[PDB]
């Protein structure tokens, strides 16, 4: 807490001492004041700081050479000290134990001042007079890592400002792109394997989506492995609904860049298929449909058999939302074209599941959709539908013999025909 000195208007003074008044102002606003213990105290000091900040954000892009070599460190320093102050603990959120929407986000106690500072820093980077080569000497990896660490705050607004300034830094500074990507790999690995709690995942996924949209070059191995071991493992987290759209956008972007990466993504999604959670099953079906829309017929054929097997499994679910979303796949004309192409393999899998749940569900809409799908199958092909029907009735009687033979034989060979009459002495308990 320091008493500010009497200062004049920047536009009134000649441009000769405009930068001297500017760096003195950058030093005056460098001082911080309490906002959580006694916000009543130092009101004069607070309003003076706010008036100074308001003049600065205006001064930017409203004068010649507002930002120059001697100004670059002072601007970075004032932004750094205020922003890099240690974040308080999530006392009331209890570490965001409650849902992020249900939990009240901790809005910055000094948001107005912070908002102004974030606005000023963005105006600084965007300004034409800003030079990345001059600033690269001063903005270093420590600045980037501190900014990335700051992404854990609650206020959505400051998170948006962080995302915007990170995008600006990534675009302007070419030399730090690899380091930024590496640090984003780490902030994602740590969240997925160690913490399992975070608030800035959506913004980081948005930043990644712009980087993928800017992957004009053919994907390098680093990008491929990063997609296969960062984005796909992110579906394991229980908070998928928070950042689902961003992850969906990112997955589609990577497949648009390279369709050869389609088969593995599909296997990873099927492996990470949720069994207990329904909302997660819903978003998984949404992701599948979005991907299914852009798949080249060739890549689709490679994984049609397990994808539709999982689809037939999910239809059987008594959940009405899961059932309706799976049955809505018949609306997309492309999926209809894909099945008309591959009916000979596709029908024998979907058909028994659809028949089994034909009358089991309680909801009327589910039954209506199932009958619609049933009529569509016999309409597209009558002979194939009849063949699937006779195979289904044959299986309905053969399942008894199968269950009788498979269960008895497995148990017998498992231990009855081995543990008991082989190496009895070595066998224990």
């Amino acid at each position: 807490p320091f008493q500010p000195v009497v200062l004049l208007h920047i536009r009134d003074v000649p441009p000769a001492d405009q930068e001297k008044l500017f760096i003195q102002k950058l030093r005056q606003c460098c001082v911080l004041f309490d906002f959580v213990s006694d916000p009543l105290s130092d009101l004069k000091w607070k309003e003076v700081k706010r008036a100074a900040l308001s003049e600065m954000v205006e001064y930017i892009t409203h004068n010649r050479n507002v930002i120059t070599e001697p100004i670059y460190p002072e601007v970075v320093h004032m932004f750094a000290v205020n922003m890099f102050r240690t974040l308080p603990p999530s006392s009331n959120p209890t570490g965001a134990e409650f849902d992020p929407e249900e939990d009240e986000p901790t809005l910055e106690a000094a948001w107005p001042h912070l908002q102004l500072v974030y606005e000023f820093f963005l105006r600084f980077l965007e300004s034409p007079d800003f030079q990345p080569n001059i600033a690269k000497k001063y903005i270093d990896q420590k600045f980037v890592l501190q900014l990335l660490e700051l992404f854990d705050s609650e206020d959505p607004r400051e998170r948006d400002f962080l995302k915007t300034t990170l995008h600006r830094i990534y675009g302007k500074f070419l030399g730090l792109r690899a380091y930024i990507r590496k640090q984003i790999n780490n902030i994602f690995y740590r969240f997925i394997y160690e913490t399992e709690h975070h608030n800035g995942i959506a913004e980081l996924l948005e930043i990644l989506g712009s980087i993928i949209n800017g992957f004009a070059l053919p994907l390098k191995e680093e990008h491929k492995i990063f997609l296969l071991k960062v984005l796909l493992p992110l579906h394991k987290v229980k908070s998928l609904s928070v950042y689902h759209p961003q992850l969906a956008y990112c997955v589609v972007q990577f497949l648009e860049k390279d369709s050869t990466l389609t088969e593995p993504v599909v296997m990873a999604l099927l492996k990470y298929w949720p069994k207990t959670h329904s909302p997660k099953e819903v978003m998984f079906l949404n992701e599948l449909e979005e991907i299914l829309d852009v798949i080249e017929p060739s890549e689709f054929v490679k994984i049609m058999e397990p994808l539709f097997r999982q689809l037939a499994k999910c239809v059987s679910s008594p959940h009405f939302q899961v059932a309706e979303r799976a049955l809505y796949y018949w609306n997309n004309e492309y999926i209809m074209s894909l099945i008309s192409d591959n009916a000979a393999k596709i029908l024998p899998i979907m058909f028994p599941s659809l028949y089994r749940n034909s009358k089991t569900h309680w909801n009327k809409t589910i039954h209506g959709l199932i009958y619609n799908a049933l009529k569509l199958f016999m309409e597209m092909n009558q002979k194939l539908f009849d063949d699937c029907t006779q195979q289904f009735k044959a299986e309905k009687l053969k399942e008894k013999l199968k269950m009788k033979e498979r269960e008895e034989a497995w148990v017998k060979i498992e231990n009855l025909a081995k543990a008991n009459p082989q190496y009895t002495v070595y066998s224990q308990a």
Binding site: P88, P89, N186, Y189, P233, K271, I413, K418, S427, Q428
Partner: protein
């Protein structure tokens, strides 16, 4: 073949679409392996386990456990090294739980290994795992450095130390966190001369690291190094590190330091503790963060207790008490809550004169505090202070507060004071309880919270077991018999509860003479709940009562109750009759 048939059934299970069957097969693999025998088990384990790796991580977890306990299947140390290759691939996998299950199994089986096999096979395996190009392998290898160290040779020991240093110097933070966590164990295994030579440089780099998590892990691990190092060396070895950790800008590091403050004080040494930890504790107690203040308040007692009694009290009165006083009126719930529970145990530590002079006014403030959490803690721990201060002085100081808190709105507060009442009843005497503490017990009994009523009944039993049966007969029985007239059936149940509870100590004679007719009269109540509870009390007092009264008065009434329309009442009357075997 004999080896082929179990391998085939497992393949069939792996190819099965149902994952549940595969999980049941891998969970029941132990017996299948018992059948194979030493000759076929090992030939099956290498190729099959590599195949099993390509399955659900849940399946991988199942074999992880199985392998961790399959020392019997391998002939012994001679064939244990065959289990290393599968475990290695199970440890280097992506998923965390299976990796943890694997490394811990590896640590468990590392002991059974022979030193020659350790150097021949285990050391190359750990070298490869530490040299892996992925962070999971490095994190797994972090956990095997300690176990294999004591039996390898000096050159192998130096190589392991160099690999551990390289792992600590890793650029990836996840690897650094695993190394920082295992630093304490590695130092414990390491020799003191080698610790001073290598552990201190690796530790300082981590303490001075920019990342906060590796910093807090380092300050947590510093306890083991402080234990091993001589006290004379700790002044110039870890004291700069402790000062930097205490003065660190990250509040998480300060919180971790505060949480383990007692351990650091114990390890460093009491004399060095007062000289270098008292200003630090005072600064940590007066910190701008709530969590560090809360952690500090928790250790306030332990730190005072472990002080050298030579000047302990002087230290407290001169440095601690001013901080506590400042902290008492702190504008935060958590710090006041933690301090209130911890502060009571400071009474005996402070000289007896100091308590009355300083602790009692702080206690009265914590008692009068609006915060519900602080007062409840004080009353729960109020038991200890009775010994330090003479009862006559103690009662005068706290009874004003006790009689105000007895009618506190929160039931939990009232529940605690009821539990503590027996102690004051015994200490003060029967005359004191009758003169001022009896009305409190009555109002407690007639309270509308059922938990309060049960606590009051238990309290009644606790005071009557020591105050004499005749005293309650001539003083409590007439008072409690009046409550039966209350219009609410719920308050009538309270009368029944206390009649049931005090019958045991009053004995058959008194029960028949005064309260048995009251229960008999109450039995004719219209509410079915009253009839249901009368039957319960009659069953309980039936053994206490004489057989002649049972047959003469209890039997006919129970017979009438069995004829009652309410299935609930009839059933319980029948149960009471069967229990007493009157019919």
């Amino acid at each position: 073949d004999d080896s082929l048939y179990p391998i085939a059934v497992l393949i069939d299970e792996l190819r099965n679409e149902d994952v549940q069957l595969r999980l049941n097969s891998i969970k029941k693999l132990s017996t299948i392996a018992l059948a194979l025998g030493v000759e076929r088990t090992r030939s099956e384990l290498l190729p099959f386990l590599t195949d099993t790796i390509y399955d659900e991580d849940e399946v991988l977890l199942a074999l992880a456990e199985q392998l961790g306990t399959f020392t019997t299947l391998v002939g012994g140390p001679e064939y244990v090294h065959c289990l290393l290759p599968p475990l290695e691939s199970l440890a280097t996998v992506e998923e965390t739980v299976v990796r943890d299950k694997a490394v811990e199994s590896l640590r468990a089986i590392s002991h059974e290994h022979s030193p020659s096999d350790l150097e021949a096979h285990f050391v190359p395996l750990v070298k490869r795992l530490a040299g892996g190009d992925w962070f999971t392998s490095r994190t797994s290898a972090c956990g095997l450095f300690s176990v294999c160290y004591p039996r390898v040779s000096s050159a192998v020991k130096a190589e392991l130390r160099q690999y551990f240093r390289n792992l600590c110097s890793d650029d990836t933070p996840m690897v650094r966190r695993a190394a920082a966590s295992k630093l304490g164990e590695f130092a414990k295994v390491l020799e003191l001369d080698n610790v001073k030579s290598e552990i201190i440089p690796m530790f300082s780099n981590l303490a001075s690291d920019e990342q906060d998590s590796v910093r807090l892990l380092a300050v947590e691990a510093c306890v083991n190094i402080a234990q091993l190092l001589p006290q004379e060396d700790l002044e110039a070895l870890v004291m700069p590190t402790l000062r930097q950790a205490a003065e660190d800008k990250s509040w998480r590091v300060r919180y971790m330091v505060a949480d383990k403050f007692t351990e650091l004080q114990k390890a460093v040494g009491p004399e060095i503790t007062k000289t270098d930890l008292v200003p630090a504790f005072q600064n940590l107690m007066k910190d701008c963060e709530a969590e560090v203040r809360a952690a500090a308040s928790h250790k306030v007692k332990e730190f005072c207790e472990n002080l050298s009694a030579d000047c302990r009290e002087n230290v407290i009165m001169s440095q601690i008490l001013p901080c506590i006083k400042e902290l008492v009126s702190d504008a935060n719930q958590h710090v006041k809550s933690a301090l209130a529970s911890v502060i009571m145990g400071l009474s005996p530590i402070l000289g007896k004169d100091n308590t009355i002079e300083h602790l009692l006014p702080l206690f009265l403030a914590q008692l009068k505090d609006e915060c519900p959490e602080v007062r409840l803690n004080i009353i729960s721990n109020l038991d200890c202070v009775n010994e330090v201060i003479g009862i006559r002085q103690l009662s005068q100081s706290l009874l004003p507060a006790i009689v105000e808190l007895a009618e506190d709105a929160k039931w939990r507060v009232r529940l605690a004071i009821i539990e503590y009442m027996p102690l004051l009843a015994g200490q003060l005497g029967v005359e004191f309880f009758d003169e001022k503490l009896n009305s409190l017990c009555m109002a407690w009994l007639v309270d509308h919270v059922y938990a309060i009523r049960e606590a009051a009944t238990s309290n009644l039993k606790k005071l009557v077991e020591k105050f004499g049966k005749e005293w309650a007969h001539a003083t409590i029985i007439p008072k409690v018999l009046a409550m039966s007239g209350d219009p609410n059936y719920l308050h009538r149940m309270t009368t029944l509860f206390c009649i049931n509870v005090l019958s045991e100590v009053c004995g058959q004679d008194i029960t028949t003479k005064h309260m048995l007719p009251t229960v008999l009269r109450m039995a004719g109540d219209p509410v079915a709940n009253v009839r249901f509870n009368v039957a319960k009390s009659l069953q309980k007092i039936g053994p206490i009562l004489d057989n002649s009264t049972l047959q003469s008065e209890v039997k006919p009434i129970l017979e009438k109750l069995t004829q009652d329309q309410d299935v609930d009442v009839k059933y319980f009357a029948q149960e009471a009759l069967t229990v007493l075997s009157l019919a």
